[model samples]
Target: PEPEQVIKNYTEELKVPPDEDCIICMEKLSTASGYSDVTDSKAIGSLAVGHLTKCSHAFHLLCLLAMYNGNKDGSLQCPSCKTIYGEKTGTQPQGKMEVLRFQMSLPGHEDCGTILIVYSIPHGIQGPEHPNPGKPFTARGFPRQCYLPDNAQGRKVLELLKVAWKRRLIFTVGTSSTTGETDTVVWNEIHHKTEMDRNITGHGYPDPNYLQNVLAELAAQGVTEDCLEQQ
Candidate 1:
């Protein structure tokens, strides 16, 4: 039988460090002699010296392990550069994504109409991958329609949202701020508007600044024109 490869990539031991304190644990990056303290509670071992090959920033190996353990997935992001070391994954529930554009002209900007995106996820028992297994989760807000203008800036957001939708980065499973519920699915930092029916929520059309604001929101989600066709 093949011995399990011990390398989890969470913590690694290279050669001896130049002797500098880790920013996270604020301890020196001392060498590890493959000794017992690596797994001990004394916080002393080769574990003391961790490395992130993705970035040049200084951080604690211990902090790296904590983030690694927190994710459990085989991926890690550089705390300094945000460069993902492995394929990143999301906790969005199994659901459907739909983007519909209607020709009906929107207010203020009568030259163009609006764009509609409907995202749907339903209540179901958690699978093995989720934090809670077998516990039925209330998906809530099925077929949630997010809006966008059809103008240049709006079209811009639509393009990036397309990328996010395909990557399943639009929503995640965690706290639902809308319902004040915990451990339920919720919208990600990416902003959207489903208020096509009424302007009561002030999410309706007619605002000239929608394009710029939506652009900022898209940038907040790490989606930008640079990620797509800059034109």
Candidate 2:
């Protein structure tokens, strides 16, 4: 299915109720009172309010369009709810996904199993999306594995990542932040737990705080819990 436009811009005046404010600018919406005036910033009273199609939040048309214009991918996310309006594709390269389970449990969950994620990508020629479209690109990590405790938060993250994976947001062709190699496949900033044992090396399970911290990490990448099943 084609991705729907995240917003429906309107010139028709939407009657802004009193006490309502534009979530973007933190300015009162009723002052403008349904004004769609994008150019007349002189009158805060006439600032146009944009109604987010997926959520109850409203933003200033001027601010909304400016943000939308800057997005090269044309994907729109509601600042209020993170409800994606259209197809939100990512920089993830063509690859495979795998899920596995382990008999042993993490520190916090003695009885529960751990969730395992494996992502794989191969080398390919660059396209227009790449820094060098015609040149060959390298995928340093053919298969990368990450870990999660099979607890509530871990499962939740898995769900959200599935969404991201489906949208091709998990990986992409870009410069290696680690190696500084251009036209290489790199993992997005969305952090993961690649370590399975010993917390000293970092991201190992059992020390606690992993679940909430991973949730925070996911949200920082716009993979909020609210994003699951909303669209």
- Best model number under lDDT: 2
- CA lDDT, every prediction? 0.63, 0.67
TM per candidate: 0.68, 0.71
What does the lDDT come to for candidate 1? 0.63
How many Å off is the CA of 76 in candidate 1? Answer: 2.0
Q: Which residue pairs come into collision in candidate 2?
A: 91-171, 91-172, 92-171
What is residue 63's positional error in candidate 2, in angstroms? Answer: 2.6
lDDT tens string, model 1, 1-231?
111111235335545676676654555656333333333333433445556665655444545654454444466666666666644445677788787889887667678888888888888777766668788777776878777768787888888887776656677767777678866878877767667544677666666676677678765555667668645
Off by over 4 Å in 1: 1-13, 31-50, 58-60, 107-111, 174-184, 205-231
Ten-residue stretch with the least lDDT total in model 2 = 2-11
**Which candidate wins on TM-score?**
2
lDDT of 1 at 164: 70
CA shift of 177, model 2, Å: 3.3
Runs of candidate 2 with Cα error greater than 4 angstroms are 1-49, 56-60, 79-84, 224-231
